[PDB]
RNA sequence: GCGAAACAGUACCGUGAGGGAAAGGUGAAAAGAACCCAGAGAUGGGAGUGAAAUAGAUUCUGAAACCAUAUGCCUACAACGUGUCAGAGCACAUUAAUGUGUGAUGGCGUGCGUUUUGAAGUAUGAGCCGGCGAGUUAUGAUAGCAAGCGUUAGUUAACCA
RNA sequence: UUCUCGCAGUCAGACAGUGGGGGAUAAGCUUCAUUGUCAAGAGGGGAAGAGCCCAGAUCAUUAAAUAAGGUCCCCAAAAUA
RNA sequence: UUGUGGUAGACGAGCGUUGUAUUGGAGUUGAAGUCAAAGCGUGAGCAUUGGUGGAUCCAAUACAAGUGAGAAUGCCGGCA
């Protein structure tokens, strides 16, 4: 159908509160200087001791 | 201009009270309970705070009723359903339930504000007197 | 303690030595006013009133009540009128008592 | 004005099946672009008729009223020609005559050569003739230098 | 009367409002009701007929 | 406070932008960088340059700790916006408002930059009443 | 000759939209809804100027009768007892205020006894 | 104010007749942001200048609606024009105030104007905000008021100073 | 309240007590005659209810006692036999 | 003393703003604007102070309004 009225700003904010994106994970990567997401690529682009891919 | 009307702000008094409804007429008991809850007998209550006190009942299922009134005002309770009615009768609550019976008999007899929601949690009805609640120092009386 | 005062049109059962605001009688600010009329004083209630007993009032300031903007608006008509009521208030307290 | 129509005298909108205003003309008094129905009409007369004798009485009244002022000292042709065409003398006169902060008017029937050339270099005084001056410079000046020569001519106005 | 204290002599009179506010009283009502020809544009047709 | 980052009229949905930079609000640089590095979107690669600029200003031209401060507030506001139309059915066109926004992020070393605002309002109140009383002693 | 009154009108409009306060969402930032809610609040206050009077009078009498019943007597009988003999000026609000006063309402009750 | 403070009847639409857009404000003086930094660039920041940099080019002033951010307050049992009066709680002192910020909750609570036989209306129309928008005026007359001037009044037309 | 003068505006009324007709002495139907309410005017009772009852209200003021109407209780509030 | 219920309808009392003319000054030693505020009037209102602000402004006195803005699915400087 079609609308009847406009929704307030706070109603919209509440609506978009749960319209957010999902969360992620944290994991210390052995072959890198920083952490990463569990079973993903790190800031150094390696899951761990095994390198997975190139950079350029 | 102002007579400085008194109402104890931030004060929600609660005193232990208990009754043994065995000579009270069911409606007389209900009107006395409504009087106690709203405060037609309270003299220093405050409406914007919690107006209820500690309220306890003894023998909530065997209140005496004079004349042909045990089965003369039957209790319906419908809802947003369609035909979803299970009308319950006076003979039923004698053995089915008494807490909901007295709660309805006082709520339809009182304001239906949100205060009753936290008033009912302060009401402790019992079909006997062996309950541990009597250890809470309640004053035994009647005609509340 | 207690004392009964009928100020202007209204009646007030108040305590001893309390400052209260009533409709303005233009009672003098700082100079004392006697009223032989009194009830419920000195823990004693006389039959009509108390005799040889007084309420002894004094005003510390005759201020003006805030802007009482009373507006009459009629639904689905063209009657929208406003008026500013500014009531002076007797801010007065009772000091001494005889019985 | 709405009489001026840029283009056809047609409707920008309609009444049925048109969710816009009722405007059946390109310009309307409410439309900001133009089309005022009640505007600044130039037909206004800007003139009110007053009686000749009424106006002469009014002139007499204002002359008498501002004769009573302080800086209205009696004047004549003699001191119109006594002063020179050079503005020096009349500023040295007015500054010492205290006609600066005032709006002093010279009541004149000579069109004096000294007055006409000067009095544009003075931010304080002005020159006007009998039949060339009204209640404006008579009264708003609050002190007008009346002339001894204009006496009898002014009397005849009644 | 110099134009710093001049006052009129009943030359201007009371000013009512027909297009000034909804609260003055007899404002948007146009002063001739709000129905019929007497209260609309190009109103008041020949009254002798 | 200082070294705040501003970008003008960047084309991005307000929803995705507000989400991806509110994932950074209240956090430091590295702890938020390593959590934004896994975002499957096309907004971090654009946003991170302003933060990099601000932090490099802090390192070279301001010389603060850098890690002491954190992203106090990101706002993607209703600035200039885009509208692109495409011909479609019935002879009409469908217009989509390709949202754009003036992005700005403010970095703070403390919960201030919002506390100091209420403090400024109250100081304004106090100097206002000082002036009003100076008028009220000059009666 | 244009008469450009814009500052006064702009200030009036800005204060009109800013007048609405304490309200949620898109309710305190639009002139028409703000004016409608102001009309509602004005009607609320005008009705209250007597509704609160009546409610507080009923409350006076309610706590008055509460103290009377805890004293063992009722307001009809109370006014009977004052009117018949020992009349006092202890009005409804005064009677209610006397209860919170320590045992002072009971003094009135025992005095108004014939 | 001319549609046009103008690179305006221009761009542009329409085959053609025919139409048809509006504009702004640097600083005394470019000193239009030295120096440096982040990305490949944008832009931003320090950075000084400049009286002053929301004057740093959104460059005299720099709003509102709208969009989001949040100091203190409330916050996960509650039927809605979210308000008014009373007022907690929590935190505090001012256009110096029967004090302030919210308002736990009670008392009281069918939007604005037209149709109106009655409209809260579930008739109506307004998304919103900031400006504007509708008994005005000339002539002549009725009334009302004020005024003039003489009892053959008042008064001037064209033309004239 | 007589009269002069300026301006009107209205002839969509609705309901109720009283005479009622028409219709089916049914109609939130018509209709006049008198009065009352809304209209053209609040409020109190009627749970809310335009018209029923009281009632005609500058406003404010936490003063009071009565009308309609309520006092077993929501819902101010009583008993007697 | 009437009052004060009011639609229609008439009548009473007046007010902000632009400019005309009178009349005063303030003026970077700080004006408008703009914002904010625990002021003052039967009412249109009088404003005050403080912040940006860096050149004009504010009181009438009467005048004349392109003078007052919520409605007409109005129009326009911007956005839900």
UniProtKB/Swiss-Prot annotation, chain A:
<dbReference type="GO" id="GO:0015934">
    <property type="term" value="C:large ribosomal subunit"/>
</dbReference>
<dbReference type="GO" id="GO:0006412">
    <property type="term" value="P:translation"/>
</dbReference>
<dbReference type="InterPro" id="IPR044957">
    <property type="entry name" value="Ribosomal_bL32_bact"/>
</dbReference>
<dbReference type="GO" id="GO:0003735">
    <property type="term" value="F:structural constituent of ribosome"/>
</dbReference>
<feature type="region of interest" description="Disordered">
    <location>
        <begin position="1"/>
        <end position="20"/>
    </location>
</feature>
<keyword id="KW-0689">Ribosomal protein</keyword>
<dbReference type="InterPro" id="IPR011332">
    <property type="entry name" value="Ribosomal_zn-bd"/>
</dbReference>
<dbReference type="InterPro" id="IPR002677">
    <property type="entry name" value="Ribosomal_bL32"/>
</dbReference>
<feature type="compositionally biased region" description="Basic residues">
    <location>
        <begin position="6"/>
        <end position="17"/>
    </location>
</feature>
<dbReference type="Pfam" id="PF01783">
    <property type="entry name" value="Ribosomal_L32p"/>
</dbReference>
<comment type="similarity">
    <text>Belongs to the bacterial ribosomal protein bL32 family.</text>
</comment>
<keyword id="KW-0687">Ribonucleoprotein</keyword>
UniProtKB/Swiss-Prot annotation, chain B:
<dbReference type="GO" id="GO:0003729">
    <property type="term" value="F:mRNA binding"/>
</dbReference>
<dbReference type="GO" id="GO:0022625">
    <property type="term" value="C:cytosolic large ribosomal subunit"/>
</dbReference>
<dbReference type="GO" id="GO:0003735">
    <property type="term" value="F:structural constituent of ribosome"/>
</dbReference>
<comment type="subunit">
    <text>Part of the 50S ribosomal subunit.</text>
</comment>
<comment type="similarity">
    <text>Belongs to the universal ribosomal protein uL13 family.</text>
</comment>
<dbReference type="InterPro" id="IPR005823">
    <property type="entry name" value="Ribosomal_uL13_bac-type"/>
</dbReference>
<protein>
    <recommendedName>
        <fullName>Large ribosomal subunit protein uL13</fullName>
    </recommendedName>
</protein>
<keyword id="KW-0689">Ribosomal protein</keyword>
<comment type="function">
    <text>This protein is one of the early assembly proteins of the 50S ribosomal subunit, although it is not seen to bind rRNA by itself. It is important during the early stages of 50S assembly.</text>
</comment>
<dbReference type="GO" id="GO:0006412">
    <property type="term" value="P:translation"/>
</dbReference>
<dbReference type="InterPro" id="IPR036899">
    <property type="entry name" value="Ribosomal_uL13_sf"/>
</dbReference>
<dbReference type="Pfam" id="PF00572">
    <property type="entry name" value="Ribosomal_L13"/>
</dbReference>
Swiss-Prot record, chain E:
<feature type="region of interest" description="Disordered">
    <location>
        <begin position="1"/>
        <end position="49"/>
    </location>
</feature>
<feature type="compositionally biased region" description="Gly residues">
    <location>
        <begin position="20"/>
        <end position="34"/>
    </location>
</feature>
<comment type="similarity">
    <text>Belongs to the universal ribosomal protein uL15 family.</text>
</comment>
<protein>
    <recommendedName>
        <fullName>Large ribosomal subunit protein uL15</fullName>
    </recommendedName>
</protein>
<feature type="compositionally biased region" description="Basic residues">
    <location>
        <begin position="8"/>
        <end position="19"/>
    </location>
</feature>
<comment type="subunit">
    <text>Part of the 50S ribosomal subunit.</text>
</comment>
<comment type="function">
    <text>Binds to the 23S rRNA.</text>
</comment>
Swiss-Prot record, chain G:
<dbReference type="GO" id="GO:0003735">
    <property type="term" value="F:structural constituent of ribosome"/>
</dbReference>
<dbReference type="InterPro" id="IPR035566">
    <property type="entry name" value="Ribosomal_protein_bL20_C"/>
</dbReference>
<keyword id="KW-0694">RNA-binding</keyword>
<dbReference type="InterPro" id="IPR005813">
    <property type="entry name" value="Ribosomal_bL20"/>
</dbReference>
<comment type="similarity">
    <text>Belongs to the bacterial ribosomal protein bL20 family.</text>
</comment>
<dbReference type="GO" id="GO:0005840">
    <property type="term" value="C:ribosome"/>
</dbReference>
<dbReference type="GO" id="GO:0006412">
    <property type="term" value="P:translation"/>
</dbReference>
<comment type="function">
    <text>Binds directly to 23S ribosomal RNA and is necessary for the in vitro assembly process of the 50S ribosomal subunit. It is not involved in the protein synthesizing functions of that subunit.</text>
</comment>
<dbReference type="GO" id="GO:1990904">
    <property type="term" value="C:ribonucleoprotein complex"/>
</dbReference>
<dbReference type="GO" id="GO:0000027">
    <property type="term" value="P:ribosomal large subunit assembly"/>
</dbReference>
<dbReference type="Pfam" id="PF00453">
    <property type="entry name" value="Ribosomal_L20"/>
</dbReference>
<dbReference type="InterPro" id="IPR049946">
    <property type="entry name" value="RIBOSOMAL_L20_CS"/>
</dbReference>
């Amino acid at each position: 159908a079609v609308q009847q009225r406009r929704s307030s700003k706070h109603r919209r904010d509440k609506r978009r509160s749960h319209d957010a994106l999902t969360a992620q994970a944290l994991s210390v990567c052995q072959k890198c200087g920083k952490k990463k997401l569990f079973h993903r690529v790190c800031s150094c682009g390696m899951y761990g001791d095994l390198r997975v891919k190139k950079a350029y | 201009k102002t007579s400085m009307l008194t109402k104890e702000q931030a004060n929600k008094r609660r005193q232990w009270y208990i009754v043994d409804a065995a000579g009270l007429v069911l409606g007389k008991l209900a009107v006395k309970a409504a009087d106690l809850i709203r405060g037609k007998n309270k003299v220093d209550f405050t409406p914007n705070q919690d107006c209820g006190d500690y309220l306890i009942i003894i023998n909530s299922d065997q209140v005496v009723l004079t004349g042909n009134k045990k089965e003369n005002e039957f209790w319906y309770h419908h809802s947003q359903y369609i035909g979803g009615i299970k009308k319950v009768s006076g003979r039923d609550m004698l053995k089915k339930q008494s807490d909901k019976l007295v709660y309805n008999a006082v709520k339809g007899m009182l304001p239906d504000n949100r205060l009753s929601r936290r008033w009912i949690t302060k009401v402790h009805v019992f079909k006997g007197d062996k309950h541990n609640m009597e250890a809470q120092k309640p004053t035994t009386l009647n005609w509340s | 303690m207690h004392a009964i005062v009928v100020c202007g049109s209204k009646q007030y059962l108040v305590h001893e030595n309390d400052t209260f605001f009533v409709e303005k009688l233009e009672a003098p600010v700082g100079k004392e006013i006697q009223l032989d009329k009194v009830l419920m004083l000195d823990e004693k209630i006389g039959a009509p009133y108390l005799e040889k007993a007084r309420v002894v009032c004094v005003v510390e300031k005759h201020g003006l009540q805030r802007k009482v903007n009373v507006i009459k608006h009629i639904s689905q008509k063209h009657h929208l009128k406003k008026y500013g009521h500014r009531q002076p208030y007797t801010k007065l307290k009772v000091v001494r008592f005889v019985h | 004005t709405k009489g001026e129509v840029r283009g056809g005298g047609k409707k920008p909108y309609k009444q049925k099946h048109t969710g816009k205003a009722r405007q059946g003309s390109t310009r309307n008094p409410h439309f900001v672009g133009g089309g005022i129905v009640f505007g600044p009409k130039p037909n206004r007369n800007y003139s009110l008729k007053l009686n000749k004798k009424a106006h002469t009485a009014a002139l007499h009244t204002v002359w008498s009223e501002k004769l009573a002022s302080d800086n209205t000292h009696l004047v004549d042709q003699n001191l119109f020609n006594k002063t020179e065409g050079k503005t020096k003398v009349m500023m040295q006169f007015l500054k010492s005559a205290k006609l600066l902060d005032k709006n002093v008017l010279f009541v004149v029937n000579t069109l004096n050569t000294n007055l006409e050339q000067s009095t544009s270099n003075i931010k304080n005084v002005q020159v006007k003739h009998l039949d060339k001056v009204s209640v404006r410079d008579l009264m708003l000046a609050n002190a007008l230098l009346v002339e001894k020569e204009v006496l009898k001519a002014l009397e005849g106005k009644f | 009367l110099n134009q710093l204290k001049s006052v009129p002599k009943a030359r201007n009179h009371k000013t009512k409002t027909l297009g000034r506010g909804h609260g003055s009283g007899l404002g948007k009502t146009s002063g001739r009701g709000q129905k019929g020809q007497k209260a609309r544009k190009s109103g008041l047709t020949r009254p002798g007929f | 406070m200082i070294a705040f980052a501003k970008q003008f009229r960047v084309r991005i949905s307000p929803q995705k932008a507000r989400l991806v930079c509110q994932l950074i609000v209240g956090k430091k640089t590295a702890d938020a960088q390593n959590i934004l590095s896994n975002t499957p979107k096309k907004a971090a690669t654009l946003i991170a340059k302003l933060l990099n600029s601000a932090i490099a200003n802090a390192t070279n031209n301001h010389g603060m700790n850098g890690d002491a401060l954190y992203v106090f507030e990101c706002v993607a506001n209703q600035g200039p916006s885009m509208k692109r139309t495409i011909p479609r059915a019935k002879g009409s066109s469908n217009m989509i408002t390709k949202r754009s926004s003036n992005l700005v992020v403010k970095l703070s070393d403390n919960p201030n930059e919002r506390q100091e605002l209420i403090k400024q309002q109250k100081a304004l109140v106090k100097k206002r009443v000082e002036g009003q009383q100076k008028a009220k002693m000059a009666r | 000759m244009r008469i450009k009154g814009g500052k006064q009108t702009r200030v009036r409009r800005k204060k009109w939209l800013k007048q609405a306060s304490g309200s949620f969402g898109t309710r305190h930032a639009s002139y028409k809804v703000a004016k409608q809610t102001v009309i509602q609040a004005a009607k609320y206050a005008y009705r209250d100027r007597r509704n609160k009077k009546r409610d507080f009078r009923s409350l006076w009498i309610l706590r008055l009768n509460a103290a009377l019943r805890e004293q063992g007597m009722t307001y009809s009988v109370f006014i009977n007892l004052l009117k018949k003999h020992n009349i006092e000026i202890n009005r409804k609000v005064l009677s209610e205020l006397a209860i919170k006063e320590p045992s002072k309402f009971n003094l009135i009750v025992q005095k108004v006894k014939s």
